[PDB]
Design a protein around this nucleic acid. Sequence first.
DNA 1: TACTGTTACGGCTCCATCAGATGGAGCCGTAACAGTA
DNA 2: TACTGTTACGGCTCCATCAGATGGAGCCGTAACAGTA
Lengths: 619, 619
Amino acid sequence: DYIVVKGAREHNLKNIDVKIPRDKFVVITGLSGSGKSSLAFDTIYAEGQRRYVESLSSYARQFQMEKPDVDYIDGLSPAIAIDSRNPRSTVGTVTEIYDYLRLLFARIGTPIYEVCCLSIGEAKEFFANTERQQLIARQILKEINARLGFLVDVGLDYLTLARAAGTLSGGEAQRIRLATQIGSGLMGVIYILDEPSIGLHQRDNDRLLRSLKKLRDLGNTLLVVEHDEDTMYASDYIIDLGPGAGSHGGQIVAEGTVEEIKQNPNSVTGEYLSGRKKIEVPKERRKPNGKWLEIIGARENNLKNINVRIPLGVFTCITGVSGSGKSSLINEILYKRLAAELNRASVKPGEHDLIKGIEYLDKVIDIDQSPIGRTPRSNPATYTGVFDFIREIFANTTEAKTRGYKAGRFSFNVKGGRCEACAGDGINKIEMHFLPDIYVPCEVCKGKRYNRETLEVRYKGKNIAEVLDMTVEEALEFFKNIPRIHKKIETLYDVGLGYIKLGQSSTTLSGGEAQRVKLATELSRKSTGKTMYILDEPTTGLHMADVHRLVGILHRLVEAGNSVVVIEHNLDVIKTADYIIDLGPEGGSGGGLVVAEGTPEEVAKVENSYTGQFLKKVL
Amino acid sequence: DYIVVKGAREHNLKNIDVKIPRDKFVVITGLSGSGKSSLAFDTIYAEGQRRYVESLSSYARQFQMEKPDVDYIDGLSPAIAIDSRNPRSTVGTVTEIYDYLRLLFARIGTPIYEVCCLSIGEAKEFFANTERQQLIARQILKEINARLGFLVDVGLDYLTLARAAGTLSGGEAQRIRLATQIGSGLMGVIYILDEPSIGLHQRDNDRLLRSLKKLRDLGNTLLVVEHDEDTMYASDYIIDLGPGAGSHGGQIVAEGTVEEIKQNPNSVTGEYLSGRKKIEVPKERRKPNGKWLEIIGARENNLKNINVRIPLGVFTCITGVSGSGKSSLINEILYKRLAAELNRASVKPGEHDLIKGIEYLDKVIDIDQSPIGRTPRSNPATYTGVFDFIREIFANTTEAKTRGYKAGRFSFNVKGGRCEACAGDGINKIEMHFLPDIYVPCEVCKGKRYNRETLEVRYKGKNIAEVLDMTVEEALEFFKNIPRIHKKIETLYDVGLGYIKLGQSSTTLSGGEAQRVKLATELSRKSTGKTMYILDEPTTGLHMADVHRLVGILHRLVEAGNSVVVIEHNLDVIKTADYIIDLGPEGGSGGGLVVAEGTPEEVAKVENSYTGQFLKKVL
DNA sequence: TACTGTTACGGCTCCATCAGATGGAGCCGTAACAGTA
DNA sequence: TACTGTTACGGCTCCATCAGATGGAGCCGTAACAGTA
Ligand SMILES: Nc1ncnc2c1ncn2[C@@H]1O[C@H](COP(=O)(O)OP(=O)(O)NP(=O)(O)O)[C@@H](O)[C@H]1O
Ligand SMILES: Nc1ncnc2c1ncn2[C@@H]1O[C@H](COP(=O)(O)OP(=O)(O)NP(=O)(O)O)[C@@H](O)[C@H]1O
Ligand SMILES: Nc1ncnc2c1ncn2[C@@H]1O[C@H](COP(=O)(O)OP(=O)(O)NP(=O)(O)O)[C@@H](O)[C@H]1O
Ligand SMILES: Nc1ncnc2c1ncn2[C@@H]1O[C@H](COP(=O)(O)OP(=O)(O)NP(=O)(O)O)[C@@H](O)[C@H]1O
Ligand SMILES: [Zn+2]
Ligand SMILES: [Zn+2]
């Protein structure tokens, strides 16, 4: 009737104990980097999967989850966790249809293109329209029909089998994954969903919530990690972590029904839910000053030759259902054209007639939708580009000049100035042939990543390792005088990473922390007073407080005289905009035209847009 | 609250529907080859495992269970099914201790025998008696300690790591497997145990029942297939199949509590439980006539130089705990010595001083404990040796003489007289690269396994395929005149296989059917009136009716003037014996001496033997 | 003289055990060139 | 003349995809030899 976890100390958990009810819809909420993903994925899912698969084949197991740093878990059950630009990965590989087709052509084929090029619906119709062949391929046909039906019911029936999954839209891919993993008709299995509401419109989120409720009604336990109010308002239990983030959080703050979290004063999530902390709605929207940017005849992806006008110098939001061509309209055409015109980028734009008003701008800055790449040779200091300035600082010291050390001698990724015993990693690489790997600190350099000769050179009494092993808040005061490093550190501090260290490995970063690192890196660049900001889904993996910080900095940038366009599905960002362009009304071939356009109130008055009705309800 | 199976037609199931309660101890009983193993293992376990692992890695899945021929299963949960003389398989490989030791020696070893040669207890004591080594091998040590503790608690703490698992006793190996598979502390998992009471004494069965009840109290479902009264008397639900075996059974006869099965008149299991059908206890035991067989100074395995005397010409049973040296005393010494003395076998006997009374015998016949080997090129006719006589019959026909066909032309395992299209298999070998294989009948020979030229030659109006595709009951009348084939078929009929066909592939045979085939093959040999029968666990995988048939034929053989020794743990066989030799009192190094010896009443009067107390309670 | 026991050899089949490689992209570091203020 | 945008190349690391081999034993078929009645 419960899952009792005792002595949970994985990552940043401060030896906490929880009692997660069974056969219930329970969410895990908190700040970015607070401990939700650790507590759920790295402990409960890991223990359940390991315990189940330990009673299985050893070779198959080698081809499981590592043991968490926990004392004991009671009431555990087998766990399934739903939770890349790869050219060699298409719809057929993900849905396994391509494997079935290859096997069928190898077995009963008579010595392909018409099936791969055909859509899901066309292929299903063709399949539905000597008995030895049927006897041989009865199971293949049954599996093909089941997979096609699941994909059609997932809301992505317009896709083609030969299309690459790297270019696949977030909503369609997420729906396909949910249909594949949820459709098993099992009972007594704990399901863990790590942020299952990314790249999904409100209607898609509602359909996913209905599907999850149906799955839970079978007699399962739903443990989802969510940041959206819609998900947390449709659950019977909430486990709130915190009270802060990073080393300042990792313990349970509040627990219970959403009303209990609302009444709880120690929970930031409850305060943001009730309304004690809220994003202020602008009383007076910024009216356009006559400066407009027009694109005529969009013909990229599912574009139906539409005309849209985006004002310059105001807050602009792009809305619509998943697959409605928001990215195709904004990124692939506008960003590429602006980059080619201004930054002299050698990139080919999308299919369009022409764009007016380009001369009104002077610079373009963009944040795409792809996540960042994780590597142990990177940290926030290297990612944001401030590490080069810090290395120049350390090479500008009198000791560095006297000893001849160059600017590249203070980096662990370049030989000649790093601990050669650990190859600059800082820890050894002891690995197990058939067991999860372990981390052992390197005793030659004691984890400082630099040898004695490098650490001898000190700037203001601190060597490179000390400044790498200290947080952004301290670096704000340490580098106050010098303007460039101060600006970069101030951007990192304002984006919300005032607790993280400058040398934390990116592989250990959370999704929200990496997202905020990317946002700070892109927004730390110089603005000339007339700049075009194109943000594509910036509030992903971000709590409402981080969303508030991002909205504040974006509005400060807008007030500085620049223009901002945000492709966001979040109502908090949408309600603060001054001009909303809506696309749709359906994903795929069913949409690609402007359902509505205007100020948020005008779009809300529109009775056709789903976003219009959602905005009317919100306002 | 239930598992609903509809349209179950795997193997010999006649499209039946069952409602198996959840979170209960439910057994599946019936005759040998009735449908228990199919219904449980091939349907419920298969569907549960496939449904769980379909939401897992594709490559790992290739390195699952085939889809059963069922309509739908409701209320399913992930399923774990507990259910060879391999020199390259020891205790370390089964318990995975050897892999851990090899990994530890590769990682922290300083550039083995003392650990492999040491027992489990010695190794545990040694392990329990720079911190970098402990940090590196903390998980390895924890896993080693957990496995050693589980093995010790399983009741097999005296074993050595270097000992081969092929020579491992049944009780110790079964206890180790149960400890390994049961110790996972999971909840909501269906456990399927296929005959978990083979090679186990009554005390070991009781300890296993206690362990299974403890495991079920966690909130799991126990679906065991059992033939022993002790297991079926400790369950809250019984699903009895039948009413016959083979093609005469496969449907549900009775279901409910053991009292309901007792009161049910249509169930054979209930009739045997209540006492309507029972094995008659001999009123007057066969007293020895002075003929005795003495072995002095046994020194094989855990033998403590004991003296035992086995009478000649009476029913003798060997009892004792698992590992008490029953096989070591009887088989390895007596059978080898008798074979070398009489049959001129070139085998080396065990370590003993000498054996008296060998000249009193004239022949030795034995049935060992190892199961039979499964191959698609064998059937009961080939296994029992009657196929050679049938082929000689078919080569003795006038058509065979006229056409020149030899005795080997009527076998599907020899080229030149078989369907070369299917290579004598009778079906094609269509295989899937990553899917379960399928069977397609060969259209060249229509499944008759023989070409037109071979099928032209007919004996008494029937060709070889027709006589191969007909049951033993028909073959009893067909071959009535000829004495050798009549004797072999009569042995096969009396052993209980009056429904099976003469050409059924052994790979499709059940455990009880293969066991009875082996018993018939060994007991069909000629007896000279003074023969020594050494049966080692003959009533394994056999229902009480098959046990009754075997007891009847054994007692007829004894009354014919021969001697029989049975190494059996079954009380039904034991209570009908005339002289019981008990070994023990503990398995492994803790036993190897005669706890008691005498008639069943005298051994029952003994207050030290566990078998004595069990016999006293039974009588 | 035939039936029955053994061994011996050739060919076919099942089962437990051992214990990854590759192409694509993303990131860090350095170099080079051009526009602007 | 310095700051900031781009491209271009070498080296390091993560992730999805492809889609078994071997030694041991057991069984069928045939041959060969020996004991017994
Ligand atoms: N190996 C590690 N050592 C120390 N801290 C770590 C380690 N790995 C992760 N952390 C930190 O632990 C905190 C919790 O991370 P995690 O639990 O994965 O994220 P989360 O709370 O689900 N947040 P987010 O994904 O951003 O919504 C973060 O501040 C991480 O930087
Ligand atoms: N390379 C491509 N070629 C053809 N069609 C594509 C391609 N990439 C995406 N599409 C389709 O174009 C439509 C719009 O996709 P896109 O505009 O990228 O999504 P989006 O609006 O950002 N939606 P989402 O990411 O879910 O919020 C969808 O039906 C996609 O499947
Ligand atoms: N492929 C098949 N086609 C037809 N009959 C089959 C096939 N496989 C197995 N059988 C028969 O189906 C019957 C049920 O076998 P099975 O269910 O495996 O045994 P069981 O009832 O558990 N008995 P046992 O193991 O002897 O205690 C037996 O008579 C088998 O010979
Ligand atoms: N080859 C061997 N070398 C040494 N010890 C052995 C060997 N085979 C078995 N043993 C041990 O000798 C003891 C008796 O085994 P054995 O007499 O073969 O079993 P059993 O009496 O038939 N018991 P069971 O089969 O469970 O009913 C056990 O402790 C075995 O582990
Ligand atoms: Zn080092
Ligand atoms: Zn054929």
